[PDB]
Amino acid sequence: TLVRPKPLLLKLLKSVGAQKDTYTMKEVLYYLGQYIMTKRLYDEKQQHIVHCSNDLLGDLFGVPSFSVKEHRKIYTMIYRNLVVVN
Ligand SMILES: CCC[C@H]1N(C(=O)c2cnccc2C(F)(F)F)CCC[C@@]1(Oc1ccc(C(F)(F)F)cc1)C(=O)N1CCN(c2ccccc2OCCO)CC1
């Protein structure tokens, strides 16, 4: 599947070195991961919990925090911020 991130998600992804406009779901996940890692959007205490209440990430996703294990919930949140392309 080829996806075109919407402007705000595009800006967030491009800010961590993503060069293109069209991505695969694995590329969005990778670049979203680089974003979490650089900005340090997690606690040493709980590695699996992303804390994003005060970040553009939580705004686009619509949640204060989420578990890295909640794959289905993460896709739902990402899907809202993209358009599927040819
Ligand atoms: C080796 C660690 C890499 C993971 N990682 C950490 O777990 C981590 C390490 N140290 C400290 C803090 C963290 C912290 F905080 F949990 F992130 C470091 C960053 C990359 C990494 O995590 C995320 C996390 C959130 C998102 C986002 F999309 F925003 F939800 C995207 C990627 C990842 O590539 N996968 C693979 C893709 N996974 C995934 C998510 C949703 C749907 C499907 C998925 O795929 C399953 C196939 O493997 C998530 C984990």
Phi, psi of 51 (to 5 degrees): -110, 110
Ligand 1 pocket: which of 15, 68, 72 to mutate (most atoms within 8 A of CB): 68
Q: For this experimental structure, what is the resolution in angstroms?
A: 2.2
Q: Whose CA is nearest to atom 45 of ligand 1?
A: 71
Q: What domain count does the chain have?
A: 1
Rg, Å, the chain Cα set: 12
CATH code: domain of residue 44? 1.10.245.10
Cβ proximity of 42 and 32 under 8 Å: no
Domain range for 35 is 1-86
Sheet strands (E) in 1-86: 2-5, 23-24, 49-51, 65-67, 82-85
- Name residue 84's beta-bridge partners: 3
Q: How many residues does the chain have?
A: 86
- Which residues touch 5 (CB under 8 Å, ≥6 apart)? 13, 21, 23, 28, 81, 82
Deposited experimental method: X-ray
